[PDB]
């Protein structure tokens, strides 16, 4: 019954509910993604505000929409479970009448769409919560992936960030990605990721979660010290001069 | 009807199903798959009304993945069933009910056992050793009835529906187009491609 | 924050303001009013005030006949009254019918009165500028005199005044039975009891009656009716031959 | 404080409700009209300022019948006017179906009376920028009545509104005075054309036209009708007349 | 003042104005400006269109509504086909139901009507158009003036939007002459050209800049534009 | 605070000034009728070097023989669009026939008003304006090649040539100068590639700009990047010749 | 029981020249063995050159008719003026038919 | 219209926070103290009760511990009566869970359902969030005891040992000091009380002004058992750790 | 028309309170004193008839009321809110549960549900708090007898012995002196007028105190015999005489 409209324009031609809603964002915690030659890695930092969780069952930041495709984020977490519960159930659902799983961009072009949808309907507030989305089409083995923003908006790229300090890791990326030569490794491509999250994580083993997706939904989140041996290796590249 | 046969021997559950669509005086398919597999461990034939059939299947296959994928998880045979036969209890009181019955057969990875359920479209629901829906069960059951033994391994089990569908085959008016046969067990579902002279 | 004087939201000081100034408006029309109970009846009395020349004195009237045993006079601006009277009524009627018996009284006005308090809780719904004073004979508690007000408020009275001199015709009646040592005018015929009614009215507000200054609402067993400017007249001569 | 002349069902500290207040200026800057009650029925006249040669005469006609027996005119917003006839004749329509017999006037006016009070309940809804007088013969008589945006309603003998209401007013007691025992109908219509032409002195800048309607139970049957034509002329001259 | 009483249609100002009617009204004002005028046999409607850059076509302002019966508008468009649109309904129903022609008297009454809803509830808008409309029914040609207070009046001529008071006056005063340009529609049109040039003072009315609408006793209301409207320059 | 539907003293509706004014912000996109085709071109204007120039969609198809290019809040546009494709094929399975530019675009824009908290005329739920406008250009056998600007005021206007953006009032202002009844196609292309190139912030490339045209044979294509790669050289020396 | 159908008989026959077509029906309209009229036309003239009949129930095949008619005014109201072309308006008609498909117009259509 | 007094409970800080949650938060940081510490044989649930009287009927009490499920209990931190909403919805859906898989519902599927309800009026609804942070401790055939913590935006996480109310920075502080892995319930029953004790803006802790609940696996059994002491069982367990 | 108001009245204030319910205290701290005594077979609630006119009949405004026959309450605010609060929970007390279980519900949980109502009126769209506080005193036969208070932001507690409204700070202390685990009904009554007293200003008798008790069976106010298991409602309100009798020994 509640429907006041509250994303509007605003006389610069603004919608501040939605550019608050990327404030929300900023604040979140960094998330990147790089894609391989023939794999795409999600990286996501881990707060450190209070320390004495039980990391088994604490919601994991990089979720599975379905068994080939998935979604990180940055912003409220509360607001990107119910993007998580409407993708997942449109996987589902376009498996079931079209016969074939989504692909990455049909997947993310819904999410988007939620969200734009959010932006002007009344009574409700946009989404405060920005995605990276990234899988492999079906039969299909070139990577995939995007990226979404509260305002609905949505592109692919080669690599990218979003949450706090995405700025500078994104120079990072933006100066040490060569579209040329992506790396073609699932080792140099999760390397390349950590390398980007220590530019903002500062020395953080457990304060960063990387996921590797390959293709035919090959999907696998690496543990404490697989991480742990790519920092290491890191940090002797730079000490090593 | 269709034959929908279901046997939990030892270590798995064997279901074996017709392959025959007949729809008035002619035979349009002999090689239909009357099964949707719900999850890696847990396999659902069904046999009833032309178009709720494979609705349903396809409609319950589409839940349970859905909360595999959520909780990452795979839920237990007899959940699945449950929520199957939810499924079914809701559908009888409705304006137009599924008619469709089901048999249930998974590997309960957590208990180690093969379980093996029964459910008809009132959302009529039974655990047992070996079930069957329709009149197949008419036929069969003297035969199961006598030589079903618990610790029988899938090899005898086999030979056992091999019997079944020999009987069936013979006392039956109906020219089902021979079964499918799958097993399910702890390493999940496998059809056996060769059953039509095993 | 200021805004918490224009709904039916609590003050600070937990005070519903709005409540407040409804109460205010029902005195808007400079109108007193009052209500005894005789032995088998009860009267309403009320001023009648017609200004305009061009107005038909007939149709001024702000005492309502709500079923045939309940009567109703209203305080405040006439729309609000009529609006209380329709709904009064209906609701009588409705009562009737789903319960196979008249409405009571007592029950009309808590009935009303819960219908007020609610315009008090809800925010779109503004309370009704008025004080509704119910009287009838009802068939178990007989003569009775039942007023509800814009804050939800309700109860019966042995007798009571409305209106901006309500203090002076209140104590007026107050003094008279802490005389008489009982809670009803001791008399068997309504005419008298409109008499005292009229009289104690009159030395209240010490003010002299035309019979077109007054109006006058009867409540007996089984029947509530008005009476007419001659009915009236007849009332105000049989005070004069004591005075 | 302050700003309890903002939202419609508001009461201000004096348990005034200011809208309405406003309401009621949209009214008085209106056209003059009037309502004379005779003694078989009654007179409507309205003022119709001639903005200009452009306007088709007689044709924007401002009277309006409710059902076969009511007339209905207004001063202020006449879109407010003819919503508010609108639904004076659903109201009408709904009570002819259950009760056969058409609406008596009184009934009639407290439907109106009802609705208008409607719209100064909630805030969500503006007051009826309109004032009406209206009336007819029924069942026991012939009523005239009179509404204002506060929803509240009298019987009259006479009554008037907008612009030049006072002259008016003041011209109706005159008559109420001068014909203790009742005007007739014939009469009440000539009188009324005077009433009109008279009130016109607070707006003599712009010229006009005059409009009158009657409900008798002897010279229309009970019926509501247009004065047209050779009555009507007989009445402007008469007014003319008594104009000087 | 006003600021406090012209946020929305349902606050009255204490002085018993609607602003934001008002406001509306103003939108009609801004707009392009259209004249109508009527003899006893038929009705004109000559507009003048709008071009944004010499790029842009230049909108229209005439809408048919039914074989007798059409309009012209000055202000916000969308409202003009809201509105048109209702009034095809309109006179669509009375043909299908009542096999009868719609009073141009009766279509007015329903657009007032049916912009006095905008002007008394919360969270609407007036509608923000002024509107001409002219047709021939049962009682011969007909003008009539909508103005989004819901006000609709029945003249013999008129016109809206800016300057529009130059063709007024030329009207008012070319009264008793085309009033009686019965049986002859190029003189009515001509007449009425005439008119709104007299509210020009940007430009001259062009070809493509010209538009006309007729209807009458033996002419269903049809429209003229560009080249059909040359002989008129 | 204020209705969303409000008018202020000059008689406009603030939502969709305001609207105006977001479209400003947006990506120059231009469109040029000729009697051989109309063509649309867009500035891409990628963020960061890392974000794939061809994943931004400014230009789609409606319809065979429509086509649009969009510029501002581009996400609003996506459900008028929908509407849009689904307009022209539902019209065609009612009528076995192809929809009007004209009346597709007429479609469109009633979406336009349909907002506010409560509007009384009909049930228009939806909080705001669109913060887009669009070219839609098309083909039809009534009308020829036609261009229009769908603006979220309702009204849309036809042009022979128009521009929408952060370089509209400039390129505009070419367009003016530049354009004839007797263009032809190449001309155009040629025409929009240059207009785009002036306004761009950045140095027009096959990457950060997208070309397209819609013709009665072939109907609505997107110029891969190939393909305006040319069209960008043939300028680029067409120029440099004076 | 109530029967919301009827059969007014009649016959209509529509032949297609090169460049004509004709579109031809009696004129009588009957009830079971009694006639309701010799005269009453079956074949319409619906504008934009069309020629409409929908013979069987008559209170069916006006609705039709009518509901026709009233889709080709509206042609124009919405595509500026354009014609409706015959092949356009015979799909309009089997969606105006096809909408009451559980409820049939009971009537044998030709245009 | 009513948009005046509309206070917009689900807007934006211009700096992307949530007004009213992040005021919930502050209003549940008033609430009386409670603790969840999960050992390895089992998970203690330890709460201080807010104000209390000499009259107070403290055996017919129960303000911050409820079951949900004989699996699942929560502390309550904020207001009583919203987290009573809460809990009955938490409640029904267990059971649906139960009814339609037959096997109770996992700790966490009911948490996150909770949260997401909370998170709704986060989002949508124009209505104010509810004041209340719950402390979750479940156990189920899968992760086993689980502790888990959910406040007023919607957001909850799981926890070795947590609190929520006032003073949760000493609390969680003096927790993280002396918590360890491989405890046991009686030793974290120990650390909870001695936690309270040390964060209380009370005099001293006594029994009367605690609640307590414990979910063990008595060893003599094999399934999962709640016990919500009752005041005599605290006056005990608080003279044993030597608080008496 | 249509309530537009669907938006939350009472709200989160930067400081963390929710004024409208501090408000809606507020305006119970105004109201008259009213209090409850709970004894070892019995519990006894009482306020004071503050008549507001000689003229009215306090008699015909009843603020201890019967919820059910086994359960009444009494406020200390507002008493148009406190009625219509006792018609919903009468109603509540069937609809819910006597036409569930068959049975009347016990103190808590019909407290609990009144509860619950007036949570609701803190949350609801375009409401305000109830602006009363409730004092229930009931007995069930798994539970004994009880006595709770129910605020306006909807929360609630059992009690010995507590008082609400005007003088609550002063009634408490006299009631924490004089309450002990071992009370008979009558000693509470005892208690009950003298804690009263205090409170009253004026006349203090059976006319201008409204007192009621939740005690042993009344099979002579069942109205009808014949079931044994039905032996009478145990909430009984002492009428203006039995009130002045143990004024006497006061």
């Not at chain 8, 267990?94 to 966490?108: F, G, H, M, R, S």
Request: glycine share 8%.
């Amino acid at each position: 019954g509640y429907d006041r409209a509250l994303s509007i324009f605003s006389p610069d031609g603004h919608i501040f509910q939605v550019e608050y809603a990327l404030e929300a964002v900023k604040r979140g915690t960094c998330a990147v993604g790089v894609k391989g030659k023939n794999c795409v890695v999600l990286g996501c930092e881990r707060r450190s505000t209070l320390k004495l969780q039980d990391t088994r069952i604490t919601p994991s930041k990089v979720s599975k929409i379905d068994s080939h495709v998935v979604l990180s984020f940055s912003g409220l977490n509360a607001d990107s479970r119910i993007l998580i519960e409407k993708a997942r159930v449109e996987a589902q659902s376009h498996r079931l009448t079209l016969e074939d799983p989504v692909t990455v961009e049909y997947l993310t072009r819904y999410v988007a769409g939620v969200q734009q949808r959010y932006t002007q309907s009344g009574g409700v507030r946009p989404f405060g919560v920005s995605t990276l989305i990234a899988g492999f089409d079906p039969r299909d083995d070139e990577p995939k992936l995007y990226q979404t923003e509260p305002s609905g908006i949505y592109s692919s790229w080669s690599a990218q960030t979003i949450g706090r300090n995405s700025k500078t890791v994104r120079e990072f990326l933006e100066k040490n990605y060569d579209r040329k030569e992506p790396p073609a490794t699932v080792e140099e491509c999760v390397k390349l990721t950590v390398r980007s999250l220590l530019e903002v994580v500062q020395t953080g083993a457990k304060n960063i979660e990387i996921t590797v997706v390959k293709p035919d939904s090959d999907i696998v989140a690496l543990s404490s010290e697989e991480i742990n041996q790519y920092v290491t290796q890191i940090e002797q590249e730079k000490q090593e001069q | 009807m269709d034959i929908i046969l279901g046997i939990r021997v030892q270590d798995s559950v064997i279901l074996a199903s017709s392959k025959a669509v007949t729809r008035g005086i002619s035979v349009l398919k002999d090689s239909d798959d009357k099964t949707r597999q719900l999850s890696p461990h847990t396999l659902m034939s069904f046999a009833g009304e032309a178009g709720d059939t494979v609705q349903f299947a396809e409609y319950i296959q589409a839940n349970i993945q859905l909360y595999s994928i959520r909780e990452d998880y795979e839920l237990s045979p007899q959940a699945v069933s449950s929520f199957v036969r939810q499924e079914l209890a809701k559908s009888i009181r409705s304006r137009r009910p599924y008619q469709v019955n089901v048999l249930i057969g998974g590997y309960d990875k957590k208990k180690n056992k093969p379980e093996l359920y029964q459910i008809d479209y009132l959302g009529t629901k039974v655990e047992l050793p070996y079930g069957a829906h329709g009149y197949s069960g008419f036929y069969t059951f003297s035969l199961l009835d006598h030589h079903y033994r618990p610790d029988m391994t899938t090899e005898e089990g086999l030979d056992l529906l091999k019997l079944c569908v020999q009987e069936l085959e013979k006392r039956m008016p109906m020219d089902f187009k021979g079964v499918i046969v799958k097993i399910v067990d702890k390493d999940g579902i496998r059809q056996v491609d060769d059953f039509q002279a095993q | 924050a200021g805004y918490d004087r224009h709904i039916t939201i609590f003050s600070p000081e937990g005070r519903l303001y709005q409540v407040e100034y409804a109460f205010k408006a029902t005195n808007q029309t400079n109108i007193n009013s009052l209500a005894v109970r005789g032995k088998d009846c009860t009267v309403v009395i009320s001023q009648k005030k017609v200004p305009d020349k061009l107005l038909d004195p007939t149709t001024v009237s702000y005492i309502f006949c709500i079923s045939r045993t309940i009567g109703m006079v209203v305080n405040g601006p006439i729309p609000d009254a009529r609006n209380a009277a329709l709904r009064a009524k209906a609701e009588a009627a409705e009562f009737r019918y789903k319960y196979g018996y008249d409405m009571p009284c007592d029950v009309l006005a808590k009935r009303m009165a819960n219908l007020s308090q609610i315009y008090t809780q809800r925010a779109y719904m503004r309370p009704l500028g008025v004080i509704l004073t119910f009287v009838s004979v009802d068939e178990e508690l007989g003569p009775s005199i039942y007023k509800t007000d814009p804050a939800g408020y309700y109860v019966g009275y042995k007798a009571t005044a409305t209106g901006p001199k309500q203090q002076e015709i209140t104590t007026n009646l107050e003094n008279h039975f802490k005389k008489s040592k009982i809670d009803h005018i001791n008399e068997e015929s309504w005419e008298k009891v409109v008499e005292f009614a009229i009289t104690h009215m009159i030395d209240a507000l010490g003010t002299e009656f035309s019979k077109n200054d007054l109006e006058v609402g009867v409540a007996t067993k089984d029947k509530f009716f008005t009476l007419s400017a001659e009915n009236i007249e007849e009332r105000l001569v049989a005070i004069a031959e004591q005075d | 404080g302050t700003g309890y002349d903002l939202s419609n069902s508001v009461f201000s500290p004096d348990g005034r409700n200011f809208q309405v207040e406003y309401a009621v200026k949209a009214v008085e800057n209106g056209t003059t009209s009037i309502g004379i009650k005779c003694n078989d029925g009654v007179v409507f006249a309205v003022e119709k300022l001639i903005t200009s040669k452009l306007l088709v005469p007689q044709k924007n006609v401002k009277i309006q019948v409710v059902d076969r027996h009511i007339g209905c005119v207004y001063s202020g917003l006449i879109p407010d006017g003819r919503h508010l006839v609108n639904r004076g004749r659903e109201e009408a329509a709904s009570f002819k179906k259950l009760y056969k017999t058409p609406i008596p006037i009184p009934a009639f006016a407290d439907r109106l009376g009802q609705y208008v009070q409607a719209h100064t309940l909630y805030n969500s809804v503006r007051p009826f920028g309109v004032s009406t007088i209206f009336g007819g013969v029924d069942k026991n008589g012939a009523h005239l009545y009179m509404l204002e945006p506060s929803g509240s309603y009298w019987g009259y003998k006479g009554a008037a509104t907008g612009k030049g209401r006072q002259s008016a007013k003041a011209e109706l007691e005159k008559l109420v005075d001068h014909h203790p025992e009742g005007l007739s109908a014939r009469e009440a219509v000539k009188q009324a054309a005077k009433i009109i032409y008279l009130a016109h002195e607070d707006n003599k800048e712009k010229d006009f036209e005059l409009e009158i309607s009657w409900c008798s139970l002897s010279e229309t049957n009970g019926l509501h009708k247009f004065v047209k034509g050779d009555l009507l002329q007989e009445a402007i001259d008469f007014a003319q007349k008594e104009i000087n | 003042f006003r600021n406090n009483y012209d946020g929305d249609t349902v606050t009255f100002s204490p002085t018993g104005r609607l602003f934001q009617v008002e406001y509306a009204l103003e939108a009609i004002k801004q707009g392009s400006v259209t004249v109508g005028l009527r003899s006893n046999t038929h009705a004109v409607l000559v507009a003048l269109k709008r071009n944004a850059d010499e790029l842009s076509s230049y909108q229209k302002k005439i809408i048919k509504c039914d074989e007798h019966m059409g309009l012209s508008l000055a202000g916000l468009a969308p409202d003009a086909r809201v509105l048109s649109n209702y009034l095809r309904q309109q006179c669509n129903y009375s043909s299908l139901v009542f096999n009868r022609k719609l009073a141009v008297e009766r279509a007015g009454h329903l657009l007032c009507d049916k912009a006095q809803k905008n002007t008394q509830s919360y969270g609407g808008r007036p509608y923000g158009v002024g509107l001409l409309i002219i047709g021939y029914d049962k009682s011969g040609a007909h003008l009539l003036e909508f103005q989004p207070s819901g006000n609709v009046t029945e003249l013999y001529g008129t016109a809206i939007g800016a300057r529009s008071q130059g063709a007024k006056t030329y009207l008012e005063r070319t009264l008793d002459t085309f009033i009686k340009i019965d049986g002859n529609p190029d003189e009515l049109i001509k007449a009425g050209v005439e008119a709104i040039s007299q509210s020009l003072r940007d430009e001259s009315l062009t070809v493509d800049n010209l538009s006309i609408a007729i209807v009458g006793k033996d002419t269903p209301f049809t429209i003229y534009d560009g080249e059909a409207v040359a002989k008129y320059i | 605070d204020r209705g969303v539907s409000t008018f202020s003293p000059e008689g406009r509706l603030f939502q969709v000034e305001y609207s105006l004014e977001a479209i400003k912000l947006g990506s120059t996109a231009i469109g040029i009728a000729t009697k051989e085709g109309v063509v649309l071109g867009v500035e891409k204007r990628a963020t960061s070097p890392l974000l794939e120039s061809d994943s931004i969609e400014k230009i789609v198809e409606i319809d065979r023989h429509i086509g649009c290019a969009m510029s501002g809040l581009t996400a609003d546009a996506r459900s008028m669009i929908e509407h849009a494709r689904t307009a022209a094929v539902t019209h065609n399975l009612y009528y076995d026939e192809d929809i009007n530019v004209e009346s597709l675009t007429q479609s469109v824009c009633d979406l336009a008003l349909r907002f506010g908290e409560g509007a009384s005329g009909e049930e228009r739920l939806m909080s705001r304006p669109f913060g887009v406008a669009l070219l839609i250009a098309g083909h039809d056998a009534d009308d020829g090649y036609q261009l229009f600007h769908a603006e979220p005021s309702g009204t849309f206007y036809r042009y022979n040539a128009k521009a929408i953006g952060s370089g509209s009032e400039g390129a505009q202002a070419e367009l003016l100068n530049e354009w004839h009844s007797s263009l032809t196609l190449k001309e155009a292309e040629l025409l929009v590639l240059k207009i785009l190139k002036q306004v761009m912030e950045e140095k027009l490339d096959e990457n950060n700009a997208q070309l397209s045209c819609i013709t009665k044979q072939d109907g609505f294509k997107i110029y891969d990047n190939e393909k305006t790669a040319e069209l960008i050289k043939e300028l680029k020396e067409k120029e440099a010749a004076e | 029981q109530f029967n919301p159908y009827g059969d007014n008989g009649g016959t209509i026959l529509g032949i297609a020249g090169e460049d004509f077509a004709v579109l031809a029906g009696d004129t009588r309209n009957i009830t079971d063995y009694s006639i309701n009229s010799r005269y009453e036309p079956k074949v319409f003239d619906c504008g934009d050159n069309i020629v409409m009949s929908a013979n069987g129930f008559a209170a069916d095949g006006d609705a039709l008719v009518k509901r026709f008619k009233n889709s080709v005014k509206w042609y124009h109201f919405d595509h500026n003026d354009k014609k409706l072309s015959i092949n356009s308006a015979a799909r309009n008609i089997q969606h105006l038919l096809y909408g009451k498909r559980f409820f049939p117009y009971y009537v044998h259509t030709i245009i | 219209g009513s948009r005046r007094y509309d206070s917009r409970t689900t807007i934006f800080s211009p700096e992307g926070r949530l007004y009213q949650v992040e005021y919930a938060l502050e209003s549940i940081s008033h609430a009386g103290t409670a603790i969840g510490i999960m050992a390895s044989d089992g998970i203690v649930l330890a709460a201080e009760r807010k104000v209390t009287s000499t009259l107070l009927e403290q055996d017919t009490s129960t303000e911050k511990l409820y079951k949900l499920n004989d699996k699942i209990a929560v502390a309550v931190a904020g207001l009583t009566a919203d987290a009573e909403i809460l809990i009955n919805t938490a409640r029904i859906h267990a059971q649906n869970y139960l009814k339609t898989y037959n096997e109770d519902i996992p700790v966490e599927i009911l948490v996150r359902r909770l949260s997401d309800i909370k998170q709704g009026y986060t989002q949508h609804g124009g209505l104010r969030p509810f004041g209340v942070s719950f402390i979750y401790a479940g156990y189920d055939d899968r992760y086993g005891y689980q502790l888990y913590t959910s406040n007023p935006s919607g957001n909850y996480t799981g926890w070795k040992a947590i609190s929520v109310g006032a003073n949760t920075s000493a609390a969680q502080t003096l927790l993280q000091m002396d918590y360890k892995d491989d405890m046991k319930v009686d030793d974290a029953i120990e650390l909870a009380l001695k936690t309270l004790s040390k964060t209380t803006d009370s005099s001293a802790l006594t029994y009367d002004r605690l609640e307590f609940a414990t979910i063990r696996k008595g060893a003599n059994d094999g399934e999962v058992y709640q016990k919500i002491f009752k005041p005599q069982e605290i006056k005990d367990i608080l003279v044993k750790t030597g608080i008496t | 028309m249509t309530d537009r108001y669907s938006f939350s009245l009472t709200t989160f204030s930067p400081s963390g309170k929710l004024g409208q319910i501090d408000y809606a205290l507020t305006a119970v701290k105004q109201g008259v004193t009213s209090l409850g005594i709970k004894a070892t077979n019995g519990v006894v609630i009482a306020t004071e008839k503050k008549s507001s006119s000689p003229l009215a009949m306090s008699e015909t405004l009843s603020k201890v009321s019967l919820l059910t026959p086994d359960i009444g309450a009494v406020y200390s605010g507002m008493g148009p809110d406190y009625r219509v609060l006792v018609d919903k929970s009468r109603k509540v007390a069937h609809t819910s549960y006597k036409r569930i279980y068959g049975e009347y519900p016990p103190t808590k949980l019909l407290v609990s549900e009144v509860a619950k109502i007036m949570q609701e009126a803190t949350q609801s769209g375009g409401v305000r708090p109830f602006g009363v506080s409730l004092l229930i005193a009931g007995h069930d036969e798994f539970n004994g007898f009880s006595l709770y208070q129910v605020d306006p932001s909807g929360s609630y507690f059992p009690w010995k012995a507590t008082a609400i409204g005007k003088g609550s700070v002063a009634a408490k202390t006299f009631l924490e002196k004089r309450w002990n685990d071992e009370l008979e009904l009558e000693d509470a009554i005892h208690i009950a007028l003298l804690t009263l007293k205090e409170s009253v200003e004026g006349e203090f008798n059976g006319d201008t105190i409204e007192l009621a008790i939740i005690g042993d069976e009344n099979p002579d106010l069942l109205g009808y015999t014949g079931i044994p298991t039905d032996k009478g409602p145990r909430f009984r309100k002492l009428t203006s005489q039995e009130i002045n009798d143990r004024l006497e020994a006061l």
